[model samples]
Target: MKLYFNGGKKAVDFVGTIAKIDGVSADDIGIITIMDNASYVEILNGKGPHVLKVMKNTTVQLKVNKAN
Candidate 1:
């Protein structure tokens, strides 16, 4: 799974925030790239809806997609 984060002048730590969603470790998430105030991360092991739900409660804006 992949997550795209946007909407902020500073970078958001998707790995750390997403990991806290369900006690996932930092190793489970990897940074793909970050540029122009947007960032992407690949989830090694996580549920889309579960992570999406938790992320919704936070101020960070993100989109979830299945990685090819």
Candidate 2:
């Protein structure tokens, strides 16, 4: 199955990892990474935030509306 990472980790790492999985690179899917306390990641598309799963116990946030 194909997976999409809405937000987490660096864009390069996310895309690169998935690329290895399915042999495809997507520009539409990306993540927002920040160094706050620890590391926070969010995903964004031109339309809006989409759902993404990182690991078995991790899921992306519901729409980060704060200004970057």
Candidate 3:
């Protein structure tokens, strides 16, 4: 699966944050690309809504979607 992040300032920390939420190692998440204030990431395994709930309190905004 993939996720979109807006208002992300740090790619490294963002990957770590997603891993922590997904209950997986950092290696499980991969950055596809980052453009301007947005970034795309690939998750080896995880639920989208679950990850969103955990991210609600953070400054960055997360958009969940399946990867083609």
Candidate with the greatest lDDT versus the true structure: 3
Give the range where candidate 1 is weakest over 10 consecutive residues by summed lDDT. 59-68
Candidate 1 matches the true fold with a TM-score of 0.59
User: Per-residue alpha-carbon lDDT of model 1 for 1-68, expressed as tens digits?
Assistant: 76666632472456557767765667677656666775666666656545656676765346544434
Q: Residues 1-68, candidate 3, lDDT per residue (tens digit)?
A: 66666644556767667766645667666556777776667765555555556667554346544444
The TM-score, computed over Cα atoms with residue i paired to residue i, of candidate 2 is 0.27
lDDT of 1 at 65: 42
Off by over 4 Å in 3: 8-10, 46-49, 57-68
By TM-score, rank the candidates, best first. Answer: 1, 3, 2
**Residue 30's lDDT in candidate 3:** 59
Model 3 lDDT, residue 58, Cα: 50
For candidate 3, the per-residue lDDT at 16 reads 63
Q: In model 2, which range of ten residues has the least summed lDDT? A: 47-56
Q: Model 2: runs farther than 4 Å from truth? A: 1-11, 18-24, 45-51, 57-68
